[PDB]
């Protein structure tokens, strides 16, 4: 069949919790490291972990290594079922809340600068909480290395190597399937971030890693073609210029702008090829740009939705 003739929403259901590589993780502590910001940090107690980022990666990796029970708080992005009853430490979306963090008495914060403010991260460290700044590569090729880096922080190198190899095998296997399913002329795609019916409506660019996702799905990322490094408002002119065949979105994001019907009311959407086919691939918010352990499964399920009727 011809995937350019497909119409309407395709939605991938939540992939769920990461399958841990072990049932008896025993962190080898203490660890000393120099983090991505150049801070020397000693990690001596991982009993109460806050694994915080924009993308939902770290919480999933920590669970994959065998430490899900050690997670005591989360951001809005870590939507995995195991953490559904865990205290949320961000507000207004992605803003760190120092009070919420400190009241959980964490023993380890794993974080990066995808969320802020930086001042809150500094406050937590000054209060005595071991805080480790990561700077993950966030590419499909580097899924294993990003996992090994997290594993080192919590003193689980063997679990890290197992989880890395398992995840990389899964994502290469999925790629084999994607390559068989892709059309000769790749679909043009963009990653459209929406939250609400107002101005939070953006084409995501290089910094957010969606090119890696779109190319992993066999598509061409029009944001990369147009040189969008951070993000761009998805206004009528930008949409007309990018003219994707498919909008890749987050499922709850799409709901928040009124579903397909609400999306079609936004200026410029209906005029694109994707708009004229109402063609949206909706991915679970907390996995969509998390990469990490579940990347292979995400690519497999999403490619089935894109290319199989
Ligand atoms: C790129 C990775 C991102 C992920 C995985 C992500 C994920 C999420 C999730 C899961 C929520 C909670 C929605 C809900 O509870 O239904 C949320 C909320 C929110 N996000 Fe993001 N987000 C991302 C990036 C962004 C960006 C780039 C912006 C702005 C430029 C943004 C602005 C917001 C705002 C304002 C909210 C508040 C929604 C509310 O009040 O319910 N997010 N995000």
- Domain contains 77: yes
Supply the CATH number for residue 199's domain.
3.40.50.1980
Last residue of a domain, one of 165, 185, 203: 165
- C-alpha angle 190/195/197, rounded to 5°? 105
Q: What SS3 class is residue 185?
A: coil
Residues 91 and 206 in one domain: no
Last residue of a domain, one of 126, 149, 165: 165
Largest distance between two CA atoms of the chain: 59
Q: What SS3 class is residue 66?
A: coil
- Domain contains 218: yes
Instruction: List Cβ neighbours of 10 (8 Å cut-off, separation of 6 or more).
Output: 280, 281, 282, 305, 306
- Domain contains 22: no
Residues 82 and 179 in one domain: no
- Domain contains 25: no
* Structure token pair of residue 198: 């107002």
- Domain contains 69: yes
Residues 11 and 103 in one domain: no
Residues 135 and 239 in one domain: no
Distance CA 211, CA 191 (A): 8
* Structure token pair of residue 248: 């890749």
Spell out which residues line ligand 1, taking CB within 6 angstroms: 54-56, 76-77, 79, 93-94, 193, 195, 200, 202, 208, 252, 285-286, 289
Residues 302 and 192 in one domain: yes
Give the CA count within 13 Å in the CB-facing half-sphere of 176.
Answer: 5
Instruction: Choose among 173, 250, 184: nearest CA to 218.
Output: 184
Structural domains of the chain, count: 2
Residues 95 and 194 in one domain: no
Instruction: Choose among 37, 19, 10: nearest CA to 82.
Output: 19
DSSP string, 123-173: HHHHTT--EEE-----SGGGHHHHHHHHHHHTT-HHHHHHHHHHHHHHHHH
Residues 134 and 156 in one domain: yes
Instruction: Choose among 308, 248, 237: nearest CA to 281.
Output: 248
Residues 185 and 142 in one domain: no
Residues 175 and 300 in one domain: yes
Q: Residue of the nearest CA to atom 36 in ligand 1?
A: 93
Range of the domain at 66: 31-165
Q: Binding site for heme b, residues?
A: 94, 193
Position in ligand 1 atom list of the atom nearest CA 255: 16
Q: Sign of torsion, CA 56 107 18 293?
A: positive
Residues 137 and 221 in one domain: no
Q: Phi/psi class of residue 270: alpha, beta or left (left: φ > 0; alpha: ψ in -120 to 50)?
A: alpha
Positions of E strands within 195-279: 201-204, 220-221, 231-233, 246-250
How remote is the CA of residue 92 from the centroid of ligand 1, in Å?
9
Residues 303 and 196 in one domain: yes
Residues 268 and 290 in one domain: yes
- Domain contains 21: no
How remote is the CA of residue 195 from the centroid of ligand 1, in Å?
6
Q: Phi/psi class of residue 140: alpha, beta or left (left: φ > 0; alpha: ψ in -120 to 50)?
A: alpha
- Domain contains 26: no
Q: What SS3 class is residue 251?
A: helix
Distance CA 56, CA 283 (A): 13
- Domain contains 283: yes
In this structure, the number of other CB atoms found within 10 A of the CB of residue 13 comes to 10
Last residue of a domain, one of 133, 165, 197: 165
DSSP code of residue 4: G
**At what resolution in Å was this solved?**
1.4
């Amino acid at each position: 069949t011809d995937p350019r003739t497909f119409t309407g929403l395709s939605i991938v259901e939540d992939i769920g919790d990461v399958v841990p590589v072990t049932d008896n993780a025993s962190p080898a502590l203490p660890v000393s490291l120099t983090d991505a910001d150049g801070n020397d940090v000693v990690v001596e107690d991982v009993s109460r972990i806050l694994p915080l980022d924009l993308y939902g990666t770290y919480s999933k990796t920590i669970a994959g290594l065998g430490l899900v029970d050690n997670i005591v708080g989360r951001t809005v992005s870590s939507t995995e079922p195991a953490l559904a009853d865990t205290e949320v430490v961000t507000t207004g979306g992605h803003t760190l809340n120092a009070e919420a963090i400190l009241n959980l008495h964490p023993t380890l914060v794993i974080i990066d600068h995808s969320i802020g403010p930086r001042e809150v991260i500094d406050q937590i460290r000054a209060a005595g909480v071991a805080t480790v700044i990561m700077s993950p590569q966030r590419s499909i090729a580097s899924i294993g290395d990003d996992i090994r880096d997290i594993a080192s922080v919590v003193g689980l190198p063997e679990e890290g190597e197992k989880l890395a190899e398992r995840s990389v095998a899964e994502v290469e296997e999925a790629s084999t399937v994607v390559d068989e399913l892709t059309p000769e002329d790749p679909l043009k795609m963009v990653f459209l971030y929406a939250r609400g019916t107002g101005g939070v409506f953006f084409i995501l660019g290089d910094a957010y890693g969606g090119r890696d996702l779109i190319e992993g799905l066999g598509g061409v990322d029009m944001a990369a073609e147009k040189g969008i490094m951070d993000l761009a408002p998805a206004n009528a002119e930008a949409l007309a210029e990018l003219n994707p065949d498919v909008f890749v979105m987050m499922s709850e994001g799409l709901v928040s702008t009124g579903g397909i019907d609400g999306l079609m009311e936004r200026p410029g959407i209906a005029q694109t090829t994707a708009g004229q086919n109402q063609r949206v691939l909706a991915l679970p918010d907390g996995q969509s740009l998390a990469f990490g352990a579940q990347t292979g499964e995400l690519l497999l399920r999403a490619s089935r939705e894109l290319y199989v009727q």
